[PDB]
């Protein structure tokens with residue numbers, strides 16, 4: 001699966017300053033010397049880790065197979081010394097979680113972001129891929145409001161001989177009950193995580209956010225599903241309820257949710273999200 005691994009990355013890319021901790025390794029800003037576009041370079045010390053190597057292999061494989069404006073564009077993977085360079089487009093607006101830091105979102109912003117996440121999920125699920133770590137931190141925005149899915153290190157792939165997955169992966173607050181129970185599951189697991197992400201975008205945090213992650217591992221399969229509480233519109237509450245069904249076959253598909261009243265009534269053009277990005281830039285500058 002490493003068939004298209006490249007060599008000598010610094011002949012095509014310039015590595016610039018560090019921009020953050022990656023799901024694996026550290027991520028640096030960089031320049032594509034061929035276009036002068038800015039890229040993100042995830043650098044992984046293959047020597048330091050080895051248990052994670054399978055997850056690193058999976059991230060590259062999944063990224064290399066995606067071609068969508070709703071999934072972080074993949075440039076390639078490059079070997080240098082003991083380091084692996086995973087190169088992707090740089091998105092200048094930060095994550096949806098970042099954008100929540102200064103204050104609450106309104107329902108137009110929530111709907112716009114959810115609509116784009118849904119387009120990303122529709123793409124992935126049509127490719128028989130399951131993201132398995134949907135949450136605001138893995139939703140990235142361009143500086144002008146485009147919304148893309150990121151961090152495919154625990155993504156799953158269905159095939160003709162593997163029609164379900166059963167791996168225990170994800171982030172506990174966002175995990176579907178059937179994933180926690182390690183039942184056979186599919187793309188409907190992402191739809192549950194989308195429901196939790198909708199609560200996260202509305203309330204600023206997922207249900208059970210104050211609890212130790214191990215505690216929520218028993219609470220989620222046991223308890224009734226979360227609902228969105230507070231003075232939110234009925235269609236937003238219904239959107240969340242639709243996603244957060246304990247029985248996965250009763251959850252809608254991403255395509256179906258793109259037609260939900262909440263999305264149709266409230267989603268607007270993505271360029272309006274620049275206001276959110278500007279709010280974050282102002283907020284960050286005085287922290």
Ligand SMILES: Nc1nc(Nc2ccc(S(N)(=O)=O)cc2)nn1C(=O)c1c(F)cccc1F
Pocket residue numbers: 019020021022023027040072088089090091092093094095098138140150151
């Ligand atoms: N492709 C990509 N672009 C960005 N951009 C970005 C811009 C600004 C900020 S911030 N609000 O100042 O901390 C953060 C990120 N990240 N990115 C990644 O793959 C990436 C990721 F998914 C998760 C964590 C770190 C990353 F680096």
Ligand SMILES: [Mg+2]
Pocket residue numbers: 023137138150151
């Ligand atoms: Mg991540």
